[PDB]
Amino acid sequence: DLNKLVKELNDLGLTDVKEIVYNPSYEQLFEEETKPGLEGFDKGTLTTLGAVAVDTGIFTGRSPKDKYIVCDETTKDTVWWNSEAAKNDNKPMTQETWKSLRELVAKQLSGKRLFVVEGYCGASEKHRIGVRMVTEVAWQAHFVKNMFIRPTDEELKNFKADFTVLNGAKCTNPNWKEQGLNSENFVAFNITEGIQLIGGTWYGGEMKKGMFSMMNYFLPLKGVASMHCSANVGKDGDVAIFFGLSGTGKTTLSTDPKRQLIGDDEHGWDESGVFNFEGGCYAKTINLSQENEPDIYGAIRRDALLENVVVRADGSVDFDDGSKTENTRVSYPIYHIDNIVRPVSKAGHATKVIFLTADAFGVLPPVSKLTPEQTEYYFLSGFTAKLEPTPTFSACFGAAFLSLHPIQYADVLVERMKASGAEAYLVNTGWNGTGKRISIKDTRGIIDAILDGSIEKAEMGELPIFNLAIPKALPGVDPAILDPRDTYADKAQWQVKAEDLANRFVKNFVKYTANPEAAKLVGAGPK
């Protein structure tokens, strides 16, 4: 009912609403994106791959410094607010400033032709958020049609919008200084009202990650895990989830011809199992090649939406050109990948949990079986490194999207694992004592041993300092690399580097000891 929709938009403050393009088909979106007369960043270009490409302007990535959550009676004592104790992007916003911003955005979307897309964040009927996004730019509607679950005709008849995203990319906030904000741009959330406002930035990710942040607020409070991970399922129905920061092999190791993909980035884990929050994938395309990333490359066709890629004069795409940004992307509905779970992106309870890390310090074992306490410790640590070794720590493998304290995500994850008897493993896909990277042959052998349970049959030893349980041998894996000390000429070399890494983990974790519940976890961390 377009009549009902317009009244609800008026309620939000949008006036003089002209034509509304509600839930357009992919064909309509293509026509809208290539419409004669589009100017600026609204303009789409049909590439030779058949996919339309658009540019996002000055913002080619998220703007965490411009992210705010309204502080009110609902959020004062529930949100994990940025503090001296532990810095994060959850910056409070007054109700007065929120109102001003809402009016600003409402004004920007008034007296115009609008696109409205309604979809779901969450494949679980019990724990999903119906999202309604309003925009004046067709490709932004396309991004949402790709990234959220597309409702059935039946669902669209009784669709309830639990959260509304008002995309006012074209407007900027003139009173930001007076208001004490970061800039004239803004990505603000009002949890009580159920609204996300976007201003100044055109980057599509703000819509995807904004809703992920909201799921990260509502779900854990209901005992449901909300995770930044990929997930897949074996032919027999066995489910595994993978965590890992960029460069840890997450995408490659969770891509297996024999296991259908549930999702590649955001999942929930409730009483029924693991479910994707998304209806598509938002992949990085820099240096993309058909040879290396056949699944992703193959997905770039009509209905995919390329972002910030360089298009040559003949319409072809130079995927190696990062002139606009190194963060070139492409979004596409999930069925552009063949090896996926259908008809709905969800499966049973996970029984294997894998934490990947590229340990540039060459200290961690290629694989360790974690205790429940260590599972929480390494989940809060969210560690990886790159080469002198430089570490990166990101709580729960996605600190930027945590609306609650890290411990709250760890608690629900381990609760779900305990019920299904799931085992967690820390897997180092990085380097060892040779100074070289662990072979992918061994890493693939390790992932196989984890999934087929052979690691559970192995004789176990224990690595000192970290007190990690490690297998002495595994089918298809070089037993000479299982203990990280064996790849060094002298174990004393490992010992020195281990004390160093242990120190970095401990120093990183100190901020969590300011949280009462998490404080005791230092006992499960190194030394």
Kindly list the residues in this chain that would bind Na ion in the complex (CB under 5 A): 26, 29-30, 303
* Residue 491 among known ligand-binding residues: no
CB of 303 to Na ion, least distance (A): 4
Q: Closer to Na ion at the Cβ: 333 or 433?
A: 333
Q: Could you give the C-alpha distances from 59 to 189, 321, 512, in angstroms and in order?
A: 19, 17, 32
Query: Which residue number, 151 or 372, has a Cβ lying nearer to Na ion?
Result: 151
Shortest separation between residue 21's beta carbon and Na ion, angstroms: 13
Catalytic residue selected from 128, 208, 329, 416: 329
Cα 490 to chain centroid distance, Å, stands at 40
Q: Is 244 annotated as a binding residue?
A: yes
- Annotation marks residue 265 as catalytic: yes
Catalytic residue check, 349: no
Strands 67-70 and 186-190: parallel
Based on the residue annotation, tell me whether 329 is a catalytic residue of this protein: yes
Give the residue with the Cβ less far from Na ion, 29 or 131. Answer: 29
- The reply to whether omega before 343 is within 30° of 0 (cis) is yes
Catalytic: which of 56, 60, 62, 483? Answer: 62
Residue 100 assigned as binding residue: no
Of the residues 145, 150, 250, 259, only one is catalytic, namely 250
Determine whether the annotation assigns residue 13 to a binding site. Answer: no
Query: Are 143 and 331 in contact, with CB atoms under 8 Å apart?
Result: yes
Integer CA distances (angstroms), 21 to 7, 18, 138, 142, in order? 15, 10, 9, 12
Told to judge if 251 belongs to the known catalytic residues of this protein, a careful annotator would answer: yes
Please name the residues in contact with 254: beta carbons below 8 A apart, sequence gap of 6 or more.
230, 231, 232, 240, 242, 261, 264
Count CB-CB contacts under 10 A for residue 70: 23
Residue 504 annotated in active site: no
Q: Which is nearer to Na ion, 88 or 146 (CB)?
A: 146
Tell me: is residue 228 an annotated ligand-binding position. Answer: yes
329 marked among binding-site residues: yes
Shortest distance in whole angstroms from residue 408 CB to Na ion: 39
Tokens of 185: 């741009």
Among 228, 346, 349, 497, which one carries the catalytic annotation? 228
Q: Minimum distance between the CB of residue 55 and Na ion, rounded to whole angstroms?
A: 17
Which residue is associated with the tokens 């058949």? 50
Q: Of the residues 91, 209, 349, 405, which is catalytic?
A: 209
132 given a catalytic annotation: no
d(CA 503, CA 525): 10
Cα–chain center distance at 463? 32
Sheet with 329-333, side-by-side order of all strands? 45-46, 52-54, 305-307, 329-333, 280-284
Least distance in angstroms from the C-beta of 316 to Na ion = 19
Shorter beta-carbon distance to Na ion: residue 30 or 488: 30
Annotated binding-site members for substrate: 62, 203, 209, 329
**Residue numbers annotated as active site:** 62, 209, 228, 246, 250-251, 265, 329
